[PDB]
From Swiss-Prot:
Subunit structure: Interacts with PRCKI and CDH5. Interacts (via PDZ 3 domain) with PTEN (via C-terminus). Component of a complex whose core is composed of ARHGAP17, AMOT, PALS1, PATJ and PARD3/PAR3. Interacts with LIMK2, AURKA and AURKB. Component of the Par polarity complex, composed of at least phosphorylated PRKCZ, PARD3 and TIAM1. Interacts with ECT2 and FBF1. Interacts (via PDZ 1 domain) with F11R/JAM1, PARD6A and PARD6B. Part of a complex with PARD6A or PARD6B, PRKCI or PRKCZ and CDC42 or RAC1. Directly interacts with TIAM1 and TIAM2. Interacts with SIRT2. Interacts (via coiled-coil domain) with FRMD4A.
Organism: Mus musculus (Mouse)
All copies of domain PDZ, residue ranges: 14-99
PTM sites of type Phosphotyrosine: 42
Shown segment, full-protein numbering: 450 to 558 of 1333
Protein name per Swiss-Prot or TrEMBL: Partitioning defective 3 homolog
Post-translational modification: Acetylated. Deacetylated by SIRT2, thereby inhibiting Schwann cell peripheral myelination. Isoform 4 and isoform 5 are phosphorylated during oocyte maturation.
Domain notes: Contains a conserved N-terminal oligomerization domain (NTD) that is involved in oligomerization and is essential for proper subapical membrane localization.
Family: Belongs to the PAR3 family.
Subcellular location field: Cytoplasm; Endomembrane system; Cell junction; Cell junction, Tight junction
Expression by tissue: All isoforms are expressed in heart, while expression in brain is mainly limited to isoform 1, and to isoform 3 to a weaker level.
Superkingdom of this protein's organism: Eukaryota
Amino acid sequence: GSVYNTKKVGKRLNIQLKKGTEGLGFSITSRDVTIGGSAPIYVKNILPRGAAIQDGRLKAGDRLIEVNGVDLAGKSQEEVVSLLRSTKMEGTVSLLVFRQEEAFHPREMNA
């Protein structure tokens, strides 16, 4: 048998993080967000200490899609920022992110 994990294309990863001293240890950013929907949330920063960085699968620039199975990628940026800031306290937080390798490149010049 053989296994080939696709190191290319966008896939979703679910990372479970337990709150420690830094809590989660990450922050979220939003880009091009007028309201939300087509413009989502990406991880803004992975702090040197914290659950997020210890796991390593969650990195800065990965797109936050859902949490615990609850779809929120169609929610406004304000809603999702509130979700993360609210910070649930069960123990582990399972967040599902979208990791994507963009096969497009910036243009040399635009006339």
